[PDB]
Amino acid sequence: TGVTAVVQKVVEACQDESKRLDLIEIARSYPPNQLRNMQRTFQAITGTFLDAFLKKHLSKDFESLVLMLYKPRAQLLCELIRGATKGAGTDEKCLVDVLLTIETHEVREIRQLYYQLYNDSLGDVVRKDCGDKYMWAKLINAVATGDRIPRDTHELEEDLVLVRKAIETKGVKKDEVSTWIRIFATYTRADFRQLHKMYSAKYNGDSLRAGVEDEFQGLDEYAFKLAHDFLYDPCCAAAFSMNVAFAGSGSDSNRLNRITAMHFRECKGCKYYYKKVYGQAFDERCATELKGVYGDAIKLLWEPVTVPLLSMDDY
């Protein structure tokens, strides 16, 4: 039903703790543009801005999640890139998570919106935020400014030999930087999946992904694994990033929030791939790592929607 009912449901969800997950049900039930229109009309209807309302009632982690959900992906990605320098350091992890998981069809609208919102170029902003020293920064710069274009069996055969050589040498040699960056930053999904298969066919079952582990450590290693998994299959990349956010003693809520908010609408296989890859059900890991409404929110967002979306305009 219509905007009135949705705004009332939002208000009742903040005022009654048993209704908190209604905020998530709303995120999962309407197209992002309609949720954006709702949030943009919420202050005009109620007298109070949405975030102000949410902060009175919700935990920081849960309100932070909700505030990423009521907008299209392009808007969310621009705000996350901008916010990566809200401190006076750079959130490198956030920039890597974002720049490496943008589909080709989305790139132009995002670059345009970024300039439109903040009147700087996204490429310039990324280059300024990250420099060009580290492999992860070289990789995201090449993605931020570049394009992914098709190739023939011929170039893939040559690159196979080059990437095997890079994998085989200790350290990232001078002449190898070009190899890593060209493949991971400029291949299409189709060609990347072909190269992946050709590699294991040529090298007795060895994998490209295992090679990344050989060559890189720390954030380099995460960034190259993330680009690999995204190019191979986005639900793989989503499962991998969520598994990393859970790693160690506690968990990274800000990363759990953005990975979930950036990807939950596109990636229906995440929980399934998670279980396949890690051997533990996503919800079971969630149950150990997270508690209360915030935990249930993350599990619920990642649950594949199986019915058609509502329309707020259908009134």
Q: Least CB distance from residue 208 to Mg ion, whole Å?
A: 14
Nearer Cβ to Mg ion, position 98 or 166? 166
Nearer Cβ to Mg ion, position 162 or 310? 162
Q: Least CB distance from residue 151 to Mg ion, whole Å?
A: 23
Q: At what angle do helices 177-186 and 153-168 cross, to 10 degrees?
A: 130
Nearer Cβ to Mg ion, position 221 or 289? 221
* Rounded-to-integer distance, Cα 84 and Cα 89, Å: 8
Q: Least CB distance from residue 166 to Mg ion, whole Å?
A: 5
CB proximity list for 35: less than 8 A, separation 6 or greater? 26, 27, 69, 70, 71
Q: Least CB distance from residue 135 to Mg ion, whole Å?
A: 11
- Quick one: how far is CA 23 from the chain centroid? 21
* Residue whose beta carbon is closest to Mg ion: 169
Nearer Cβ to Mg ion, position 25 or 175? 175
Nearer Cβ to Mg ion, position 105 or 170? 170
DSSP assignments along 25-84, one per residue? HHHHHS-HHHHHHHHHHHHHHHSS-HHHHHHHHS-HHHHHHHHHHSS-HHHHHHHHHHHT
* Rounded-to-integer distance, Cα 311 and Cα 315, Å: 8
Count of positions (residues) in the chain: 315
Q: Least CB distance from residue 216 to Mg ion, whole Å?
A: 9
Q: Least CB distance from residue 30 to Mg ion, whole Å?
A: 48
* Rounded-to-integer distance, Cα 259 and Cα 200, Å: 29
The structure tokens 């908010």 sit at: 261
CA distances from 51 to 55, 60, 65 (A): 6, 11, 11
Residue 294's CB is within 10 A of a number of other CB atoms, namely 21
Q: Least CB distance from residue 198 to Mg ion, whole Å?
A: 20
Residues lying near Mg ion in the complex (CB under 5 A) are found at 166, 169
Q: Least CB distance from residue 10 to Mg ion, whole Å?
A: 53
Closest CA to 101 of 125, 76, 67: 76
* Rounded-to-integer distance, Cα 78 and Cα 84, Å: 10
Nearer Cβ to Mg ion, position 107 or 177? 177
Could you give the count of Cα atoms lying within 13 Å of 180 in the half-sphere of its Cβ?
Answer: 30
Nearer Cβ to Mg ion, position 183 or 286? 183
Nearer Cβ to Mg ion, position 79 or 215? 215
